[PDB]
């Protein structure tokens, strides 16, 4: 509670909150804004989303390998924040109106060309704020819990006021970007008060080596983990990046249909919260490789159940069937990898794997479901992948490297010793 008085704690538990709150529209909602609001065929977003991934992938490095080391002098965030006061002014003026000039090609390109600030942006905010957090006293361990509740408070208003007035949310989105994103820059801090003098003296920068990857590349744990990451997660996300409309159509109208947009997510969070706590116990008292597959088992049922999607208050369940993976996978990797690779490796795993590969699977994969959807449908496409992926969660039963190689429980000293 010594955080009670903490200033830079107060000034960033807000930055987090009022940024995620900001992003707290653009994305989850996004899909609607395409189809409904701006009528665009699924397959045309299957190219949007697929392209979104192309900017990410070949960018994320440039912020990580950049800021992480070089620029750690509080700048970039101004670069990001800059492209944020132009939330609506882009969307409602440029992004939207561009594609409408039917050239999806050049329009979606000059699109997530302001989609990074959120995709590769957040992890950048999440970043600096962490670095800074740690140096101040009270880390990000709870200041984010102050930022991931903007999803919440927002969510409802974004799934509501948007319908009534689409410009509202977006227009307001640049404002909470203005006075709110900036106010925390003329009230920020950057001086490591009485610690060390140099930046290469006392931190926690694991490093990335090409060789490193190459000493990991011979490894089966790697490929066979990837297999999971890929198929399961990948094609899983793919499905969600274009699930909505589906679920949305099930209701009375758009208002009722959507609305359950805020109401949905805005709920599961206080539930994804719940899980969060009591996860480890399970996880660890369950093992990562194991408990991980159960997330993939879960996802599956969500794409697989979606073949049947009968009711509207069924599809709701098929949504909240979401926060049951969020946990299990998330940390299930953390403790899987950790617990199956030479620690210093993480870089490449987390890097190579969940990027120089995923976004890559995503470039392709997605597009398929975009055409898979428009030409054969939501339930149709599902059975292809709701299945195809299940054939991974199912094979990864073998595929993946089980419970401890040559250490029964002795080579276990990392979080309590």
CSV table of C-alpha atoms in Angstrom, one decimal:
chain,number,residue,atom,x,y,z
A,1,UNK,CA,0.0,0.0,0.0
A,2,UNK,CA,3.1,2.2,-0.1
A,3,UNK,CA,1.9,2.7,-3.6
A,4,UNK,CA,-0.9,4.8,-2.1
A,5,UNK,CA,1.3,7.9,-2.2
A,6,UNK,CA,3.4,6.9,-5.2
A,7,UNK,CA,3.3,9.6,-7.9
A,8,UNK,CA,4.7,8.0,-11.1
A,9,UNK,CA,2.6,5.1,-10.0
A,10,UNK,CA,-0.5,7.2,-10.1
A,11,UNK,CA,0.6,8.9,-13.3
A,12,UNK,CA,1.0,5.6,-15.2
A,13,UNK,CA,-1.8,3.4,-13.7
A,14,UNK,CA,-3.7,6.1,-15.5
A,15,UNK,CA,-1.6,6.1,-18.7
A,16,UNK,CA,-2.1,2.4,-18.9
A,17,UNK,CA,-5.9,2.7,-18.2
A,18,UNK,CA,-6.5,5.7,-20.6
A,19,UNK,CA,-4.5,4.1,-23.4
A,20,UNK,CA,-6.0,0.6,-23.3
A,21,UNK,CA,-9.3,2.4,-22.8
A,22,UNK,CA,-8.4,4.3,-26.0
A,23,UNK,CA,-7.4,1.1,-27.8
A,24,UNK,CA,-10.4,-0.2,-25.9
A,25,UNK,CA,-12.4,0.6,-29.0
A,26,UNK,CA,-10.5,0.4,-32.2
A,27,UNK,CA,-9.8,-3.3,-31.9
A,28,UNK,CA,-12.4,-5.6,-30.4
A,29,UNK,CA,-15.0,-3.4,-32.0
A,30,UNK,CA,-13.0,-2.8,-35.2
A,31,UNK,CA,-14.6,-5.8,-37.2
A,32,UNK,CA,-18.1,-4.3,-37.0
A,33,UNK,CA,-16.8,-0.9,-38.2
A,34,UNK,CA,-15.6,-2.7,-41.3
A,35,UNK,CA,-18.6,-4.9,-42.3
A,36,UNK,CA,-21.6,-3.2,-40.8
A,37,UNK,CA,-20.5,0.5,-40.5
A,38,UNK,CA,-18.4,0.4,-43.7
A,39,UNK,CA,-19.8,-2.7,-45.5
A,40,UNK,CA,-16.8,-4.8,-46.6
A,41,UNK,CA,-16.9,-8.5,-47.4
A,42,UNK,CA,-15.3,-10.8,-45.0
A,43,UNK,CA,-12.7,-12.0,-47.4
A,44,UNK,CA,-11.8,-8.2,-47.7
A,45,UNK,CA,-11.0,-8.1,-44.0
A,46,UNK,CA,-9.4,-11.5,-44.3
A,47,UNK,CA,-6.9,-9.4,-46.2
A,48,UNK,CA,-7.1,-6.5,-43.7
A,49,UNK,CA,-6.4,-8.7,-40.8
A,50,UNK,CA,-3.8,-10.7,-42.7
A,51,UNK,CA,-2.1,-7.5,-43.7
A,52,UNK,CA,-2.4,-6.1,-40.2
A,53,UNK,CA,-0.1,-9.0,-39.3
A,54,UNK,CA,2.4,-8.0,-42.0
A,55,UNK,CA,3.0,-4.6,-40.5
A,56,UNK,CA,3.3,-6.1,-37.0
A,57,UNK,CA,5.7,-8.9,-37.7
A,58,UNK,CA,8.1,-6.7,-39.7
A,59,UNK,CA,8.0,-3.9,-37.2
A,60,UNK,CA,7.8,-5.4,-33.7
A,61,UNK,CA,11.5,-6.1,-33.9
A,62,UNK,CA,12.2,-2.5,-34.8
A,63,UNK,CA,10.7,-1.4,-31.5
A,64,UNK,CA,11.9,-4.2,-29.4
A,65,UNK,CA,15.5,-4.5,-30.7
A,66,UNK,CA,15.2,-0.6,-30.8
A,67,UNK,CA,13.8,0.8,-27.6
A,68,UNK,CA,14.6,-2.2,-25.4
A,69,UNK,CA,18.3,-1.2,-25.9
A,70,UNK,CA,19.0,2.0,-27.8
A,71,UNK,CA,16.1,4.2,-27.1
A,72,UNK,CA,15.1,3.7,-23.5
A,73,UNK,CA,15.0,7.5,-23.0
A,74,UNK,CA,11.2,8.0,-22.9
A,75,UNK,CA,10.8,9.2,-26.5
A,76,UNK,CA,9.0,6.8,-28.8
A,77,UNK,CA,5.9,7.0,-26.6
A,78,UNK,CA,5.6,10.4,-28.0
A,79,UNK,CA,5.8,8.9,-31.5
A,80,UNK,CA,3.0,6.5,-30.6
A,81,UNK,CA,0.9,9.0,-28.6
A,82,UNK,CA,1.4,11.3,-31.6
A,83,UNK,CA,-0.4,8.8,-34.0
A,84,UNK,CA,-3.0,8.4,-31.3
A,85,UNK,CA,-4.4,12.0,-31.0
A,86,UNK,CA,-5.3,11.1,-34.6
A,87,UNK,CA,-7.5,8.1,-33.7
A,88,UNK,CA,-10.8,9.2,-35.3
A,89,UNK,CA,-9.2,11.9,-37.5
A,90,UNK,CA,-7.6,8.9,-39.2
A,91,UNK,CA,-10.4,6.4,-39.1
A,92,UNK,CA,-13.5,8.5,-39.6
A,93,UNK,CA,-11.5,10.7,-42.0
A,94,UNK,CA,-8.7,8.7,-43.7
A,95,UNK,CA,-8.8,4.9,-43.0
A,96,UNK,CA,-12.5,4.5,-43.4
A,97,UNK,CA,-12.8,6.8,-46.4
A,98,UNK,CA,-9.7,5.3,-48.1
A,99,UNK,CA,-10.8,1.7,-48.5
A,100,UNK,CA,-14.2,3.1,-49.6
A,101,UNK,CA,-12.1,4.2,-52.5
A,102,UNK,CA,-12.3,0.5,-53.1
A,103,UNK,CA,-8.5,0.0,-53.2
A,104,UNK,CA,-8.2,-2.3,-50.2
A,105,UNK,CA,-4.7,-3.0,-51.4
A,106,UNK,CA,-3.3,0.5,-50.8
A,107,UNK,CA,-6.0,1.4,-48.3
A,108,UNK,CA,-5.4,-1.4,-45.8
A,109,UNK,CA,-1.6,-0.8,-46.2
A,110,UNK,CA,-1.9,2.8,-45.3
A,111,UNK,CA,-4.1,1.3,-42.5
A,112,UNK,CA,-2.4,-0.7,-39.7
A,113,UNK,CA,0.2,1.7,-40.8
A,114,UNK,CA,-1.5,3.0,-37.6
A,115,UNK,CA,-2.3,-0.4,-36.2
A,116,UNK,CA,1.2,-1.1,-35.0
A,117,UNK,CA,0.9,1.6,-32.3
A,118,UNK,CA,-1.7,-0.8,-30.8
A,119,UNK,CA,-0.3,-4.2,-31.8
A,120,UNK,CA,3.4,-3.5,-31.5
A,121,UNK,CA,2.5,-0.3,-29.6
A,122,UNK,CA,0.9,-1.6,-26.4
A,123,UNK,CA,3.8,-4.0,-25.7
A,124,UNK,CA,5.9,-0.9,-26.0
A,125,UNK,CA,3.8,1.0,-23.6
A,126,UNK,CA,3.5,-2.1,-21.4
A,127,UNK,CA,7.3,-2.1,-21.7
A,128,UNK,CA,8.6,1.3,-20.8
A,129,UNK,CA,6.0,1.6,-18.1
A,130,UNK,CA,7.4,-1.6,-16.7
A,131,UNK,CA,11.0,-0.5,-16.9
A,132,UNK,CA,10.0,2.8,-15.3
A,133,UNK,CA,7.7,1.1,-12.9
A,134,UNK,CA,10.5,-1.1,-11.5
A,135,UNK,CA,12.9,1.8,-11.1
A,136,UNK,CA,10.3,3.9,-9.1
A,137,UNK,CA,9.3,1.3,-6.5
A,138,UNK,CA,6.0,-0.5,-7.3
A,139,UNK,CA,6.3,-2.3,-10.6
A,140,UNK,CA,3.6,-3.0,-13.2
A,141,UNK,CA,2.3,-5.9,-11.2
A,142,UNK,CA,-0.8,-3.9,-10.3
A,143,UNK,CA,-0.6,-0.7,-12.3
A,144,UNK,CA,-1.7,-2.8,-15.3
A,145,UNK,CA,-4.6,-4.1,-13.3
A,146,UNK,CA,-5.4,-0.3,-13.3
A,147,UNK,CA,-5.1,-0.3,-17.1
A,148,UNK,CA,-6.8,-3.5,-18.1
A,149,UNK,CA,-10.0,-2.2,-16.4
A,150,UNK,CA,-10.3,0.5,-19.1
A,151,UNK,CA,-11.1,-2.3,-21.5
A,152,UNK,CA,-14.0,-2.8,-19.0
A,153,UNK,CA,-15.4,0.7,-18.3
A,154,UNK,CA,-14.9,1.4,-21.9
A,155,UNK,CA,-16.1,-1.8,-23.6
A,156,UNK,CA,-19.7,-1.1,-22.6
A,157,UNK,CA,-19.7,2.4,-24.1
A,158,UNK,CA,-17.9,1.4,-27.2
A,159,UNK,CA,-20.3,-1.4,-28.0
A,160,UNK,CA,-23.2,1.0,-27.3
A,161,UNK,CA,-22.6,4.7,-28.1
A,162,UNK,CA,-20.9,3.6,-31.3
A,163,UNK,CA,-24.1,2.2,-32.8
A,164,UNK,CA,-26.0,5.3,-31.9
A,165,UNK,CA,-23.1,7.6,-33.1
A,166,UNK,CA,-20.1,5.9,-34.6
A,167,UNK,CA,-18.0,9.1,-34.6
A,168,UNK,CA,-18.5,9.5,-30.8
A,169,UNK,CA,-16.2,6.7,-29.6
A,170,UNK,CA,-13.6,7.3,-32.3
A,171,UNK,CA,-13.8,11.1,-32.0
A,172,UNK,CA,-13.6,10.7,-28.2
A,173,UNK,CA,-10.8,8.2,-28.6
A,174,UNK,CA,-8.4,10.9,-29.8
A,175,UNK,CA,-9.4,13.1,-26.9
A,176,UNK,CA,-8.7,10.7,-24.1
A,177,UNK,CA,-5.6,10.4,-26.2
A,178,UNK,CA,-5.0,14.1,-26.1
A,179,UNK,CA,-5.5,15.7,-22.6
A,180,UNK,CA,-5.1,12.3,-21.2
A,181,UNK,CA,-2.2,10.7,-23.0
A,182,UNK,CA,-0.2,14.0,-22.8
A,183,UNK,CA,-1.0,15.2,-19.3
A,184,UNK,CA,1.2,12.2,-18.2
A,185,UNK,CA,4.2,13.7,-20.1
A,186,UNK,CA,4.3,17.0,-18.4
A,187,UNK,CA,3.9,15.1,-15.2
A,188,UNK,CA,6.3,12.2,-15.9
A,189,UNK,CA,9.8,11.2,-14.6
A,190,UNK,CA,13.0,9.8,-16.0
A,191,UNK,CA,15.8,10.2,-13.4
A,192,UNK,CA,17.0,7.1,-11.6
A,193,UNK,CA,17.2,8.8,-8.2
A,194,UNK,CA,20.4,7.6,-6.5
A,195,UNK,CA,20.9,4.2,-8.2
A,196,UNK,CA,23.5,3.7,-11.0
A,197,UNK,CA,25.0,6.0,-13.7
A,198,UNK,CA,25.1,3.8,-16.9
A,199,UNK,CA,22.3,1.9,-18.7
A,200,UNK,CA,24.4,-1.2,-19.2
A,201,UNK,CA,24.9,-1.5,-15.4
A,202,UNK,CA,22.1,-3.2,-13.4
A,203,UNK,CA,19.0,-4.4,-15.2
A,204,UNK,CA,17.5,-7.5,-16.8
A,205,UNK,CA,18.1,-7.6,-20.5
A,206,UNK,CA,18.1,-11.3,-21.7
A,207,UNK,CA,19.9,-11.2,-25.1
A,208,UNK,CA,19.0,-12.5,-28.6
A,209,UNK,CA,21.5,-14.5,-30.7
A,210,UNK,CA,21.1,-15.9,-34.1
A,211,UNK,CA,23.3,-18.8,-33.0
A,212,UNK,CA,21.2,-19.0,-29.9
A,213,UNK,CA,18.2,-19.8,-32.2
A,214,UNK,CA,20.4,-22.2,-34.1
A,215,UNK,CA,21.3,-24.1,-30.9
A,216,UNK,CA,17.5,-24.2,-30.3
A,217,UNK,CA,16.7,-25.1,-33.9
A,218,UNK,CA,18.0,-28.7,-33.6
A,219,UNK,CA,15.4,-29.1,-30.8
A,220,UNK,CA,12.2,-31.1,-31.2
A,221,UNK,CA,10.6,-29.4,-28.1
A,222,UNK,CA,10.8,-26.3,-30.4
A,223,UNK,CA,9.3,-27.5,-33.6
A,224,UNK,CA,6.7,-29.6,-31.8
A,225,UNK,CA,5.8,-26.7,-29.6
A,226,UNK,CA,5.6,-24.4,-32.6
A,227,UNK,CA,3.1,-26.9,-34.1
A,228,UNK,CA,0.9,-26.0,-31.2
A,229,UNK,CA,1.5,-22.3,-31.2
A,230,UNK,CA,0.8,-22.4,-35.0
A,231,UNK,CA,-2.2,-24.5,-35.7
A,232,UNK,CA,-4.0,-24.2,-32.4
A,233,UNK,CA,-3.4,-20.7,-31.2
A,234,UNK,CA,-2.7,-19.2,-34.7
A,235,UNK,CA,-5.7,-20.5,-36.6
A,236,UNK,CA,-7.6,-20.1,-33.4
A,237,UNK,CA,-7.0,-16.4,-33.2
A,238,UNK,CA,-7.6,-16.3,-37.0
A,239,UNK,CA,-11.1,-17.5,-36.2
A,240,UNK,CA,-11.7,-14.9,-33.6
A,241,UNK,CA,-10.3,-12.1,-35.6
A,242,UNK,CA,-13.6,-12.6,-37.6
A,243,UNK,CA,-15.9,-14.3,-35.1
A,244,UNK,CA,-18.0,-11.3,-34.1
A,245,UNK,CA,-20.4,-10.6,-37.0
A,246,UNK,CA,-21.3,-14.2,-36.5
A,247,UNK,CA,-22.3,-13.9,-32.9
A,248,UNK,CA,-23.6,-10.4,-33.6
A,249,UNK,CA,-26.1,-11.6,-36.2
A,250,UNK,CA,-27.8,-14.0,-33.7
A,251,UNK,CA,-29.7,-11.2,-31.8
A,252,UNK,CA,-32.7,-9.1,-32.4
A,253,UNK,CA,-30.8,-6.3,-34.3
A,254,UNK,CA,-27.4,-4.7,-34.3
A,255,UNK,CA,-28.0,-2.8,-31.1
A,256,UNK,CA,-29.2,-5.8,-29.2
A,257,UNK,CA,-26.9,-8.0,-31.3
A,258,UNK,CA,-23.8,-5.9,-30.8
A,259,UNK,CA,-24.6,-4.3,-27.4
A,260,UNK,CA,-23.9,-7.8,-25.9
A,261,UNK,CA,-20.5,-6.8,-27.3
A,262,UNK,CA,-19.7,-4.5,-24.4
A,263,UNK,CA,-21.8,-6.6,-22.0
A,264,UNK,CA,-19.9,-9.7,-23.1
A,265,UNK,CA,-16.2,-9.0,-22.9
A,266,UNK,CA,-16.8,-6.3,-20.2
A,267,UNK,CA,-17.9,-9.3,-18.1
A,268,UNK,CA,-15.5,-12.1,-18.7
A,269,UNK,CA,-12.6,-9.7,-17.8
A,270,UNK,CA,-13.7,-9.6,-14.2
A,271,UNK,CA,-13.7,-13.3,-14.8
A,272,UNK,CA,-10.5,-13.6,-16.7
A,273,UNK,CA,-9.5,-11.7,-13.6
A,274,UNK,CA,-10.8,-14.5,-11.4
A,275,UNK,CA,-8.9,-17.2,-13.3
A,276,UNK,CA,-5.7,-15.1,-13.3
A,277,UNK,CA,-5.4,-15.5,-9.5
A,278,UNK,CA,-6.0,-19.2,-9.1
A,279,UNK,CA,-4.2,-20.2,-12.3
A,280,UNK,CA,-0.6,-20.8,-11.2
A,281,UNK,CA,-1.7,-23.3,-8.5
A,282,UNK,CA,-3.4,-25.2,-11.2
A,283,UNK,CA,-0.8,-24.6,-13.8
A,284,UNK,CA,2.2,-25.6,-11.7
A,285,UNK,CA,0.2,-28.1,-9.7
A,286,UNK,CA,-0.7,-29.3,-13.2
A,287,UNK,CA,2.4,-28.7,-15.3
A,288,UNK,CA,2.5,-26.4,-18.3
A,289,UNK,CA,2.7,-28.8,-21.3
A,290,UNK,CA,-0.4,-30.5,-19.9
A,291,UNK,CA,-2.6,-27.7,-18.7
A,292,UNK,CA,-1.6,-26.0,-22.0
A,293,UNK,CA,-3.3,-28.6,-24.2
A,294,UNK,CA,-6.4,-28.2,-22.1
A,295,UNK,CA,-6.6,-24.6,-23.4
A,296,UNK,CA,-6.3,-25.9,-26.9
A,297,UNK,CA,-9.0,-28.4,-26.1
A,298,UNK,CA,-11.0,-25.4,-25.0
A,299,UNK,CA,-10.4,-23.1,-27.9
A,300,UNK,CA,-11.4,-26.1,-30.2
A,301,UNK,CA,-14.8,-26.5,-28.6
A,302,UNK,CA,-15.3,-22.8,-29.3
A,303,UNK,CA,-14.7,-23.1,-33.0
A,304,UNK,CA,-16.2,-26.6,-33.0
A,305,UNK,CA,-19.2,-25.6,-31.0
A,306,UNK,CA,-19.6,-22.8,-33.5
A,307,UNK,CA,-20.5,-25.3,-36.3
A,308,UNK,CA,-23.7,-25.8,-34.4
A,309,UNK,CA,-24.2,-22.2,-33.2
A,310,UNK,CA,-28.0,-22.6,-32.9
A,311,UNK,CA,-29.2,-20.0,-30.4
A,312,UNK,CA,-28.1,-16.4,-29.6
A,313,UNK,CA,-27.9,-17.2,-25.9
A,314,UNK,CA,-25.7,-20.2,-26.9
A,315,UNK,CA,-23.3,-18.2,-28.9
A,316,UNK,CA,-22.9,-16.1,-25.8
A,317,UNK,CA,-21.6,-19.1,-24.0
A,318,UNK,CA,-19.4,-19.8,-27.1
A,319,UNK,CA,-17.9,-16.5,-26.4
A,320,UNK,CA,-17.4,-16.6,-22.6
A,321,UNK,CA,-15.9,-20.0,-23.5
A,322,UNK,CA,-13.0,-17.5,-24.2
A,323,UNK,CA,-11.7,-16.6,-20.8
A,324,UNK,CA,-11.0,-20.3,-20.2
A,325,UNK,CA,-8.1,-20.3,-22.7
A,326,UNK,CA,-6.8,-16.8,-22.1
A,327,UNK,CA,-5.4,-18.1,-18.9
A,328,UNK,CA,-4.3,-21.7,-19.6
A,329,UNK,CA,-2.4,-20.8,-22.8
A,330,UNK,CA,-0.9,-17.4,-21.7
A,331,UNK,CA,1.0,-18.6,-18.7
A,332,UNK,CA,0.9,-22.2,-19.9
A,333,UNK,CA,3.6,-21.2,-22.3
A,334,UNK,CA,5.5,-19.2,-19.9
A,335,UNK,CA,5.9,-22.2,-17.6
A,336,UNK,CA,6.1,-24.6,-20.5
A,337,UNK,CA,9.0,-23.0,-22.3
A,338,UNK,CA,10.8,-21.8,-19.2
A,339,UNK,CA,10.4,-25.4,-18.0
A,340,UNK,CA,11.7,-27.0,-21.2
A,341,UNK,CA,14.5,-24.7,-22.7
A,342,UNK,CA,17.8,-23.2,-21.6
A,343,UNK,CA,16.5,-20.1,-19.9
A,344,UNK,CA,18.8,-17.7,-21.8
A,345,UNK,CA,16.9,-19.0,-24.9
A,346,UNK,CA,13.5,-17.4,-24.1
A,347,UNK,CA,14.5,-14.6,-26.5
A,348,UNK,CA,14.3,-16.6,-29.6
A,349,UNK,CA,11.4,-18.8,-28.4
A,350,UNK,CA,9.2,-15.8,-27.4
A,351,UNK,CA,10.7,-13.8,-30.3
A,352,UNK,CA,11.2,-16.2,-33.2
A,353,UNK,CA,8.3,-18.3,-32.3
A,354,UNK,CA,5.5,-15.9,-31.3
A,355,UNK,CA,6.4,-13.4,-34.1
A,356,UNK,CA,8.9,-14.2,-36.8
A,357,UNK,CA,6.5,-17.1,-37.2
A,358,UNK,CA,3.0,-16.5,-35.8
A,359,UNK,CA,2.2,-13.2,-37.5
A,360,UNK,CA,3.7,-15.0,-40.4
A,361,UNK,CA,1.3,-17.9,-40.1
A,362,UNK,CA,-1.3,-15.2,-39.7
A,363,UNK,CA,-0.5,-13.4,-42.9
A,364,UNK,CA,-1.6,-16.6,-44.8
A,365,UNK,CA,-3.8,-18.6,-42.4
A,366,UNK,CA,-6.2,-15.6,-41.9
A,367,UNK,CA,-6.8,-14.8,-45.5
A,368,UNK,CA,-8.0,-18.4,-45.9
A,369,UNK,CA,-10.7,-18.0,-43.3
A,370,UNK,CA,-11.6,-14.7,-45.0
A,371,UNK,CA,-12.3,-16.5,-48.2
A,372,UNK,CA,-13.2,-19.6,-46.2
A,373,UNK,CA,-15.9,-17.5,-44.6
A,374,UNK,CA,-17.4,-15.6,-47.5
A,375,UNK,CA,-17.5,-18.5,-49.9
A,376,UNK,CA,-18.5,-21.3,-47.5
A,377,UNK,CA,-19.6,-19.5,-44.3
A,378,UNK,CA,-19.0,-19.0,-40.7
A,379,UNK,CA,-20.2,-22.5,-39.5
A,380,UNK,CA,-18.8,-24.0,-42.7
A,381,UNK,CA,-15.3,-22.5,-42.4
A,382,UNK,CA,-15.4,-23.5,-38.7
A,383,UNK,CA,-15.7,-27.2,-39.3
A,384,UNK,CA,-12.6,-26.9,-41.5
A,385,UNK,CA,-10.5,-25.3,-38.8
A,386,UNK,CA,-12.6,-25.8,-35.7
A,387,UNK,CA,-11.5,-29.3,-36.6
A,388,UNK,CA,-8.2,-28.8,-38.3
A,389,UNK,CA,-6.9,-27.2,-35.2
A,390,UNK,CA,-8.4,-29.9,-32.9
A,391,UNK,CA,-6.2,-32.3,-34.9
A,392,UNK,CA,-3.3,-30.5,-33.2
A,393,UNK,CA,-4.5,-30.2,-29.6
A,394,UNK,CA,-5.1,-33.9,-30.2
A,395,UNK,CA,-1.8,-34.7,-31.8
A,396,UNK,CA,0.1,-32.4,-29.5
A,397,UNK,CA,-0.9,-35.0,-27.0
A,398,UNK,CA,2.1,-36.7,-28.4
A,399,UNK,CA,3.8,-34.0,-30.5
A,400,UNK,CA,4.8,-32.0,-27.5
A,401,UNK,CA,7.5,-33.1,-24.9
A,402,UNK,CA,5.8,-34.4,-21.8
A,403,UNK,CA,6.6,-34.3,-18.0
A,404,UNK,CA,10.4,-33.7,-17.3
A,405,UNK,CA,13.3,-35.3,-19.3
A,406,UNK,CA,15.9,-36.5,-16.8
A,407,UNK,CA,14.9,-34.6,-13.6
A,408,UNK,CA,12.0,-36.1,-11.7
A,409,UNK,CA,11.5,-32.9,-9.6
A,410,UNK,CA,15.1,-32.1,-8.5
A,411,UNK,CA,15.9,-29.7,-11.3
A,412,UNK,CA,13.1,-27.4,-10.0
A,413,UNK,CA,14.4,-24.3,-8.3
A,414,UNK,CA,13.3,-21.0,-9.9
A,415,UNK,CA,10.4,-19.2,-8.1
A,416,UNK,CA,10.9,-20.4,-4.5
A,417,UNK,CA,14.7,-20.7,-4.2
